[PDB]
Design an enzyme around this catalytic site. Structure first.
Site: not given
Length: 88
Positions: A14-16, A19
Site C-alpha cells: 500500500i503506497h501513496a 493509500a
C-alpha cells in the site's frame, strides 16, 4: 465502531497511490475510519501514516470506522483495496 481486516498481496505495499484512494474513499464518506496494521493503528485519513505503515506484502492490515457510514466506509475500503489488488 466497525473495522475490517485484510491481507497485503501487492509487492508494492500500500503506497501513496492506493493509500490515497483508501484514505480518500475513507474520509470521503464521513465516518471516522482508521487504518491498522499488526496492531499498528493509524489515521485512514492521512497518507504519511498509511505510507509509513510499511504495508508490506504478505502483511495483514486493518481499517476501522466509527460513524454513520462506518460500515459503508468499510465496504468502500475493501473495494478500494481489492479495486487496486493490494489484497486478495
Amino acid at each position: 465502531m466497525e473495522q475490517n481486516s485484510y491481507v497485503i498481496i501487492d509487492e508494492t505495499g500500500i503506497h501513496a497511490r492506493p493509500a490515497t484512494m483508501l484514505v480518500q474513499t475513507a474520509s470521503k464518506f464521513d465516518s471516522d475510519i482508521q487504518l491498522e496494521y499488526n496492531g499498528k493503528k493509524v489515521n485512514l485519513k492521512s497518507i504519511m501514516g498509511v505510507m509509513s505503515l510499511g504495508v508490506g506484502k504478505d502483511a495483514e492490515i486493518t481499517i476501522y470506522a466509527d460513524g454513520s457510514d462506518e460500515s459503508d466506509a468499510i465496504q468502500a475500503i475493501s473495494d478500494v483495496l481489492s479495486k487496486e489488488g493490494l489484497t486478495k
